[PDB]
Amino acid sequence: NPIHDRTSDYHKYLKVKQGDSDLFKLTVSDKRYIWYNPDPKERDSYECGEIVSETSDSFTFKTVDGQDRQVKKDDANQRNPIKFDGVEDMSELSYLNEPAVFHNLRVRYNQDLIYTYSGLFLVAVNPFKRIPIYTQEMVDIFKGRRRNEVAPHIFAISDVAYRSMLDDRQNQSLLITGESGAGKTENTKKVIQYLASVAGRNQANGSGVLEQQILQANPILEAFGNAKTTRNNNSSRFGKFIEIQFNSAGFISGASIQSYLLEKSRVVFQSETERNYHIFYQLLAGATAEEKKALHLAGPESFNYLNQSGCVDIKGVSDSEEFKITRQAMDIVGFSQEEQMSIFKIIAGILHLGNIKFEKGAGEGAVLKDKTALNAASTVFGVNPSVLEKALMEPRILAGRDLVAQHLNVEKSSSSRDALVKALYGRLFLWLVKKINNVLCQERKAYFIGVLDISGFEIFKVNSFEQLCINYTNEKLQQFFNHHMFKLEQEEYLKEKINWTFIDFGLDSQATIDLIDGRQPPGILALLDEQSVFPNATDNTLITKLHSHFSKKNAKYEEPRFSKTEFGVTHYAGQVMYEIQDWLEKNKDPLQQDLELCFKDSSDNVVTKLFNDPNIASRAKKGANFITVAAQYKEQLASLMATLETTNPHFVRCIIPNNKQLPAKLEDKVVLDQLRCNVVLEGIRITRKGFPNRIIYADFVKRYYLLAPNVPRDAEDSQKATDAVLKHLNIDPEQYRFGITKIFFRAGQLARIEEARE
């Protein structure tokens, strides 16, 4: 069934399926109605009442329940001629506030249509349901086709990103970012595929190795990288730019993925209904009774690095076999049949490491009573016992010009193997990516398409040092948009002639950023660094200094009234509240060189290659030694942004619909909560007052021609044929400036013409 019309794979759960009847009876608009919030107590969940008033100073209307209270034309959220229901790019709206769009966004959803537009902004709200909208024909309907000629889709920004490059020959970016719970993992999970097939190399159906050797390189990532939390069954657990290259003709060539921040904590600790990195269960749950004692696990329940928080009982999908997939994916993108055993040789020495119970030493001196965990735990990494344990409880500190063997009590031996138990996962993994990257990795690399998988503003009263870094990058981003989409009105003003009494809008947030990473005048990250320099620092000081530098001195910083262990910043979207605690330690990630020394050698080319390579056990030795997680997280985002700033971008946003994994309900308590969370609506409502239902430009020929006698169809050209109409009828010229070449009906000056049906 040819792609044209209605009745197939596409129109059904993809395209709003237009009707088999042709004329303007699909609907007809008159009168008006306003959105509103029945209860003056709740700022969510509005309603719909008919206007009866048109006050000059005020505005008034009807209601369902009795009340008939009034509302300033300015605080009123209007409702559109219900002729726009599932309108594909929302700019086409006439009136826009919120309710007016959690509405257009729901109908777009009632019909199971996750994808939508905001001019430049694709909104995509995760369904949780299974909706075939990806199959191989969803592809051949897109390839080589224009955003106009097809309903919205990930496959509809994912090609554009490709074609523009081919022709508007320039490196290209895709930026996907959403509240973690948003499925932004699958979105990316498709751009790669889609591209991979159109620039997919075979005759008409196939792809020879490379293009595939790639597809299986996420299973690795998802296997360790992704993990399952209250918010999902499989949470993108980490940030990364997976990013890919081609040769000039058009055929895909390379890939290079760089990752960063991970909940390295998800190893030692997880909570209610939570589990671990899946590598961990399929590990035990999947190894033939053979290798299971080849290293000795027996019970996964038997383990406490896994048998703590409730649900390890592994909901829905089967994993026993998912193993044959990941393990089937590593030595397919080529992973040795011998060494990739070590991965395992490792994932378990970790496990035995979360099983030892250093018990208060008689008097003091904390010590383990008996030992087989550790004996075993050492017997895969291959590291002598009177060594491993000794650096652990008895680590050699250096007081001045002499250095000795302190004996830890529990209070601290307790958290050592805790902190060393991430140093490996955090580590193995980083290098583990280091591998496959460096063969999908490319050389001259003519062009590239990088795609960005980053998070939204993680805002919670429990946010700490981490919450900042990700939120520092986010701010860093919404200028890239605001500034980029700024230079938009740049060309815009070379073809509508003379330009707007203008904003010259610059960073309204160079400010906030400057407060974080400001050199001089310094910022949070400066003092963080500045003090991380020695011990007699008691985060107590850390905050005391801050309120001195900042408090009553920076528009974005606020000092709490009664609370003292914490403060608050005023980010792009409202305030954030960071508490301090171990920021001073979390800033280093310390670990005794009594231990490296114990693991910097072994039997094993990798746990040697882990604490033996300078780009895996270290960071560039600057200012005499290691630079801090704060300084670095600066060195690398900027580099990232640097790159971004030289490529064309396309932003995609992932809206989480509800908090219990429920496909079906779609609660305004959340969606809305974030709609504002992104500059999606306010992205224009503020920005494009000036040109309304930005058409395919100035095309007054047979598209809309029912006006009685005077405004015809094709006079001489696609521009003029009736102009002396608003200068005349309705009101004046103002609505439309008159650029020599282009012009725009400012719809916003309509109240004398276009509301009835004929």
Is the alpha carbon torsion for 457, 463, 468, 469 positive or negative? Answer: negative
Per-residue DSSP letter, 26: G
Return the closest-CA partner of residue 657 out of 193, 126, 119, 5. Answer: 126
End-to-end CA separation in angstroms for the chain: 36
Q: In whole angstroms, how large is the CA radius of gyration of the chain?
A: 30
Q: Is residue 235 among the annotated active site residues?
A: yes
Q: With 0-12 CB in 10 A as exposed, 13-18 as middle and 19+ as buried, what is 667?
A: middle
Give the angle subtended at the CA of 420 by the CAs of 415 and 422, to the nearest 5°.
105
Q: In what order do the strands lie in the sheet with 575-576?
A: 557-558, 568-570, 575-576
Q: Is residue 19 among the annotated active site residues?
A: no
Q: Is residue 716 among the annotated active site residues?
A: no
Give the residue carrying structure tokens 């058009």: 250
Q: In one letter, which amino acid is 200?
A: G
Contact 246, 199 (CB under 8 A): yes
Pure H helices in 317-401: 322-330, 340-351, 373-377, 385-393
77, 91, 177, 185: which one is catalytic?
185
Question: How far apart are the C-alpha atoms of 629 and 728, rounded to whole Å?
Answer: 66
Give the three-state DSSP class for 161. Answer: helix
Q: Does the bond joining 521 to the residue before it have cis omega, within 30 degrees of 0?
A: yes
Given resolution (angstroms): 3.4
Per-residue DSSP letter, 51: B
CA distances 563 to 190, 545, 559, 577, 579, Å, are 46, 16, 8, 11, 10
647 is in an annotated binding site: no
290 is in an annotated binding site: no
Six-digit token pair at 195? Answer: 């591209």
| DSSP assignment of 700-757 | -SSSS--SSTT--S-SSSSS-S--TTTTTSSS-STTS-B-SS-B---GGG-SSS--S-
Question: How far apart are the C-alpha atoms of 199 and 191, rounded to whole Å?
Answer: 12
Q: Is residue 458 among the annotated active site residues?
A: yes
- Count of CB atoms within 10 A of residue 295's CB? 19
91, 197, 232, 326: which one is catalytic?
232
- Count of CB atoms within 10 A of residue 516's CB? 22
Query: For strand 447-455 and strand 404-405, is the pairing parallel, antiparallel, or unpaired?
Result: unpaired
Q: Is residue 185 among the annotated active site residues?
A: yes
Q: With 0-12 CB in 10 A as exposed, 13-18 as middle and 19+ as buried, what is 473?
A: buried
β-bridge mates for residue 568, sequence order: 558
Question: How far apart are the C-alpha atoms of 71 and 453, rounded to whole Å?
Answer: 42
Produce one character per residue of 188-197: b if its CB has 16 or more CB atoms within 10 Å, e if not: bbbbbbbbbb
Question: How far apart are the C-alpha atoms of 666 and 658, rounded to whole Å?
Answer: 6
Q: Phi-psi bin for 355: left (phi > 0), alpha (psi -120 to 50), beta?
A: alpha
Give the three-state DSSP class for 178. Answer: strand
Return the closest-CA partner of residue 109 out of 596, 612, 650, 668. Answer: 668
Q: What are phi and psi of 583, to 5 degrees?
A: -45, -35
Q: List the domain range (segments joined by +) for residue 500.
A: 455-589+634-645
Query: For strand 366-367 and strand 359-360, is the pairing parallel, antiparallel, or unpaired?
Result: antiparallel
Q: What are phi and psi of 223, to 5 degrees?
A: -55, -55
Question: How far apart are the C-alpha atoms of 567 and 564, rounded to whole Å?
Answer: 8
Question: How far apart are the C-alpha atoms of 626 and 603, rounded to whole Å?
Answer: 27
Give the angle subtended at the CA of 515 by the CAs of 688 and 571, to the nearest 5°.
45
Query: For strand 575-576 and strand 252-262, is the pairing parallel, antiparallel, or unpaired?
Result: unpaired
207 is in an annotated binding site: no
Q: Which residues contact 271 (CB under 8 A, 6 or more apart)?
A: 309
β-bridge mates for residue 743, sequence order: 738
Q: Residue 246 belongs to what H/E stretch?
A: strand 238-246
Q: In one letter, which amino acid is 575?
A: Q
450 is in an annotated binding site: no
| DSSP assignment of 566-617 | B-EEE-SSSEE--B-TTHHHHTT----HHHHHHHSSSS-TTHHHHSSSTTTS
Contact 447, 647 (CB under 8 A): no
Question: How far apart are the C-alpha atoms of 298 and 288, rounded to whole Å?
Answer: 11
Contact 219, 326 (CB under 8 A): yes
Instruction: Residue 485: give its domain's CATH number.
Output: 1.20.58.530
Contact 672, 44 (CB under 8 A): yes
180 is in an annotated binding site: yes
Q: Is residue 226 among the annotated active site residues?
A: no
Per-residue DSSP letter, 169: -
184 is in an annotated binding site: yes
Strands (E), 19-141: 33-36, 47-50, 77-78, 115-118, 121-125
Contact 299, 348 (CB under 8 A): no
Give the three-state DSSP class for 348. Answer: helix
Question: How far apart are the C-alpha atoms of 148 and 634, rounded to whole Å?
Answer: 40
| DSSP assignment of 277-336 | BTHHHHHHHHS-HHHHHHTT---STT-TTTSSSS--S--SS--TTHHHHHHHHHTTS---
Is the alpha carbon torsion for 418, 423, 428, 430 positive or negative? Answer: positive
Q: Is residue 646 among the annotated active site residues?
A: no
- Count of CB atoms within 10 A of residue 53's CB? 13
Contact 488, 648 (CB under 8 A): no
Is the alpha carbon torsion for 79, 748, 485, 169 positive or negative? Answer: positive
Query: For strand 447-455 and strand 172-178, is the pairing parallel, antiparallel, or unpaired?
Result: parallel
